Design a protein around this nucleic acid. Structure first.
Lengths: 173, 151, 112, 260
RNA sequence: CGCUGCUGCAGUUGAAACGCCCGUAGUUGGCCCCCCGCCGCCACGAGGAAACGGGAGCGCUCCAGGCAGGCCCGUUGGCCC
RNA sequence: CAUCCGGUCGAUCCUGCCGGAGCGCGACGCUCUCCCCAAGGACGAAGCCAUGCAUGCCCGCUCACCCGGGACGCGGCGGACGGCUCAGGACAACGGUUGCACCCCCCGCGGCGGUCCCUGCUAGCCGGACACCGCUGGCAACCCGGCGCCAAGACGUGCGCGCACGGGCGCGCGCCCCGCGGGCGAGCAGCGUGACGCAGCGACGGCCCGCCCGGGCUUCCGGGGCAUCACCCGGUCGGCGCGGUCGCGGCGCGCCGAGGGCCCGACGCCUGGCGGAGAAUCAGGGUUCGACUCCGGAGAGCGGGCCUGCGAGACGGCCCGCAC
RNA sequence: ACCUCGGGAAAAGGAGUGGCUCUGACGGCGCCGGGUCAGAACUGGAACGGACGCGGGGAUCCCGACUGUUUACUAGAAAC
């Protein structure tokens, strides 16, 4: 199947290499499974959180997320963390196609529901930039985990000079 | 800050540390590899981020530590080193002067010109041709001739 | 492997059928003989359901030496002791390991 | 080669086993156990080859299956069971108790010991690690994992295990002035006191040890095995690792043949 | 077979000095500082499979072999590559 | 273990080759008293195959019958080793030297054994559900269909103790650097807390960890010939973000930059090219060969693809295309 | 291939192309213009330069090098 072997690759000088052997199980690669965010929970409940375990080397099960709807999102400064529905993927550094299809990959900037974090509004002097996002019901966060390997979409709420970079990217629209 | 597609942060330092009371928590990670090597003041105090820098990034210098001349610094944050070595044959009791180009990673902290004596330490595969990181730089007078040098 | 499809066709040389309705016109051979089971229950829970009971068992249907199905899934006095003994062994392991952990922490405090 | 190797060729098997070249195409391959393939001799070779108690491999099974042999006080029925440095090989039916140490040449030697000696077994701590809930654990050369080690005992030290209780009776540190036998390597069996500890950071620590004769022998610190603080505290082979030179060895060989 | 020449070949005439000059890569560069760092260098160690090739000792009747043997270094099977 | 000698002339001295003379290790001819040792369809057909055999063993589960003789079946482990061959492959394979602070591992050895819930426990021990089996068939053969009985240390669940606890998260070193340390050469490990998740194993207790053994890569140096092959490569060379893998990595993709390799021979071609430990011959220096015994690689007509497992891209496993 | 090194050459041959829904670039910023060039989904009886406009091509041989010019009203040629 898919091979991560460098035998197919050309040398540093750009020379052709020689195929001395046939493909091996150890150098197997698997088809990528893009975790699609379920943004259609209202439309249908048939598409539920679907995570699939796969058999790997050494019988080490790896959980591959096919569809996900929620994640544990952590506001590090306030130390407030709650399970939150992910509303949409807005900004992925690798491509805009992943943002349109709403694939959940590590580091994709996601908008999360602020209904769990609504309590934080009561305490002021807790980062105005996070607080006005909380009032609006959408908070800028980033997935901090790999959904394909872990099977979960844990993250953290964008804060400090990171929040500014990604809010500037999504500022015109 | 808009040309860059992604925000480059040090994984070790939390972006929320850049809020009030900057003095309370360190905003820069500067690990010191040992083997009698010292973190430069440029690494300790550097705006650069580099996840493959051996002083401020998530890499470990382990294995062989070699020293060689700079052949080219043209590649971005990468350098080609010309390791010069003698090979001895028996049929003729003479030697053969031989050269090997090894690809290293220049940290942004180190400034190098083609000719400087660099010290390179083995690291995890960083690219197809890069398994080394520059941990010391020795400057040269630019008009330094060439000289076959085993370093 | 090659398999015919799940549809009746005139090609079929053999058909396998089961009786789902009877009521009247009792079939000449199908309903004529009730065939006894070749084997009697072996699991002890099944044996106790057979007599409507729910470690008695022991008695069983015999067939001529009268062959007896070796009793299965029945807690014998030895089995009951084994389960209790293994429970005790794990409980002791918990006691000894916890005792060592507290002692080691005290030794660590002694040296700082 | 698609998987684990289950066979050993006789020419491949280590020289310290001393297996005759014509004896077979195959050699006994030791099972995985307290000692590694290079640092161990199978039980078939320590019975059928050394003691000749069993004249054939099937007879080694018949005496091992009957648990007549005891290794480290454990029945150890496996024919290919590895036996290594400091393991206690005792057969009660023939009333013989042996401790395996290394001879001066470097082959393993079954040394006769006493009942007090049989009780304790010497082990070297290779590494101390925070495994299983961050609990402290030590690892000895004989594949022994002991949780809650004494906080002081460092790595390279020699612990003494009770065998019956498997508790550390005492620890001997690795330091200058400590009796050490080099296990494995060109200098094997040699007994001396550490005189130098050259770190050579990033590579291998180089230990120089001095024999009573005054012959200085240098080896990597992995091969070095502390025996005691100023005396072995264990049976040492009759030679006592002084090590003979080639012309002395010739003289001893001539002396033995003359008294035939 | 010093008829491939490192040892160690030949080029006036036998085969063979490029018509000449500049010149980069390459190879090669006088003398000089005792006492210092890097190099090569030589010595000696570690550590890394044997077999083989040696090679200790042993009369398979000799021998090519083999690791035997004999009341024996803790009998051996050392040691080297 | 430092040797020459015959042949250009009318004669001579040379250069220079030719031929001899020694050994190998195969073929061939001829001949053979006995014993010991011993290679043996490798050599431009990795062409092709008739026949037999080369991988079984066990009993946890017997109301098969010989009474426990136990047939079979189910379950377990092994079949990935070993045996064979050298086609492919020329910064590859391989050999010495490294690293994994980038990893995976059955057996065994030695440790370790606290597992939230709601519902809903039967734990003096729970279900159902097949195989053999019996009954009835199709079938040239191969192959199996239906119905019915009935078991496992098998299967599906589950009685667990909120220092409950698998994964992955978020947060928690600094103040120029280096000097106690669980651990290092090195900031590594472990855990404290906040959320998520609810993994495994417990129906004849193993998750788990060290060691071992094998593997995956990886560091340096060595690693054919040809210039009637001098310029070559564009995932090619780096960076960044993801994915993927046991894991690192252009391994893959998106994006940015233009690198990378070369007369110390790049690249291309060619190889009646596996490499090494070694072997032949020999003063010394050398030359030639490395199918084969041991070691590592590769492949089972040729391409692919896969399943099972801890490990196989397995061919005395399967699926497919081609050739037969 | 050949060549007068300019050509041959649109050599020979292939592949894509519509509509929608987006995403990049590129100037003059607060603003405010651009209409090109890429890239991606999604669709459609297997459709797209959907009309129109718009080379068939290759190997030869003879002759005249060529662009030109000519018998208006039968020869455009190799003739001039």
């Amino acid at each position: 199947g898919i091979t991560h072997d460098k035998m197919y690759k050309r040398s540093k000088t750009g020379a052709v290499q020689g195929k001395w052997h046939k493909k091996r199980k150890y150098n197997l690669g698997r088809q990528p499974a893009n975790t699609k965010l379920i943004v259609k929970v209202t439309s249908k409940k048939n598409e539920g959180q679907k995570i699939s375990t796969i058999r790997c080397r050494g019988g080490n099960i790896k959980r591959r997320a096919l569809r996900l709807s929620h994640g544990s999102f952590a506001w590090g400064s306030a130390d407030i963390s709650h399970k939150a529905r992910i509303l949409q993927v807005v900004y992925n550094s690798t491509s805009n196609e992943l943002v349109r299809t709403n694939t959940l990959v590590k580091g994709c900037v996601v908008q999360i529901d602020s209904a769990p974090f609504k309590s934080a509004l009561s305490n002021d002097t807790l980062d105005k930039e996070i607080l006005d996002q909380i009032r609006g019901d959408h908070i800028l966060a980033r997935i901090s985990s790999r959904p394909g390997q872990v099977g979960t979409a844990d993250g953290y709420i964008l804060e400090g000079p990171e929040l500014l970079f990604y809010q500037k990217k999504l500022a015109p629209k | 800050n808009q040309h860059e597609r992604a925000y480059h942060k040090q994984s070790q330092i939390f972006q929320g540390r850049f809020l009030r009371k900057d003095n309370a928590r360190c905003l820069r990670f500067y690990k010191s590899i040992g083997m009698g090597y010292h973190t430069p003041i440029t690494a300790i105090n550097g705006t650069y981020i580099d996840k493959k820098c051996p002083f401020t990034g998530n890499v470990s210098i382990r294995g062989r530590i070699l020293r060689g001349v700079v052949h080219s610094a043209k590649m971005q944050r990468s350098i080609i080193v010309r390791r010069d070595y003698l090979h001895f044959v028996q049929k003729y009791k003479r030697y053969e002067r031989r050269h090997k180009h090894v690809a290293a990673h220049l940290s942004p902290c180190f400034r190098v010109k083609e000719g400087d004596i660099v010290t390179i330490g083995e690291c995890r595969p960083l690219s197809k041709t890069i398994r080394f990181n520059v941990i010391k730089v020795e400057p040269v007078s630019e008009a330094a001739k060439k000289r076959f040098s085993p370093f | 492997k090659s398999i015919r499809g799940c549809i009746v066709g005139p090609d079929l040389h053999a058909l396998s059928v089961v009786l789902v309705d009877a009521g009247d016109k009792t079939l000449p051979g199908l309903t004529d003989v009730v065939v006894p089971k070749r084997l009697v229950p072996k699991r002890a829970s099944k044996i106790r359901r057979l007599f409507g009971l729910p470690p008695k068992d022991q008695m069983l249907v015999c067939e001529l030496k009268l062959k007896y199905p070796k009793v299965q899934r029945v807690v014998t006095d030895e089995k009951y002791a084994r389960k209790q003994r293994v429970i005790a062994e794990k409980k002791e392991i918990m006691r000894k390991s916890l005792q060592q952990l507290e002692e080691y922490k005290a030794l660590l405090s002694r040296m700082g | 080669a698609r998987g684990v190797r289950k066979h050993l060729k006789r020419l491949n098997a280590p020289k310290h086993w001393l297996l005759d070249k014509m004896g077979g195409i195959w050699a006994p391959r030791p099972t995985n156990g307290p000692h590694g393939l290079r640092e161990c001799i199978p039980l078939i070779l320590i019975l059928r080859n050394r003691l000749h108690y069993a004249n054939t491999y099937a007879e080694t099974s018949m005496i091992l299956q009957d648990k007549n042999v005891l290794i480290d006080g454990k029945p150890r029925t496996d024919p290919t069971f590895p036996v290594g440095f400091m393991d206690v090989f005792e057969i009660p039916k023939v009333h013989k108790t042996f401790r395996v140490l290394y001879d001066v040449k470097g082959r393993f030697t079954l040394v006769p010991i006493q009942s007090n000696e049989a009780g304790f077994k010497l082990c070297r701590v290779q590494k101390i690690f925070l495994g299983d809930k961050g609990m402290p654990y030590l690892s000895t050369h004989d594949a022994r994992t002991i949780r809650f080690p004494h906080p002081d005992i460092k790595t390279n030290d020699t612990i003494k295990i009770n065998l019956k209780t498997g508790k550390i009776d005492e620890w001997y540190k690795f330091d200058i002035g400590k009796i050490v036998m080099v296990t494995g390597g060109r200098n094997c069996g040699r007994i001396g006191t550490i005189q130098a500890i050259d770190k050579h950071m990033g590579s291998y620590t180089m230990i120089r040890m001095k024999d009573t004769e005054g012959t200085e022998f240098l080896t990597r610190l992995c091969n070095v095995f502390v025996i005691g603080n100023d005396s072995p505290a264990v049976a040492i082979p009759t030679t006592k690792g002084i090590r003979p030179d080639i012309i002395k060895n010739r003289e001893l060989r001539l002396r033995s043949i003359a008294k035939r």
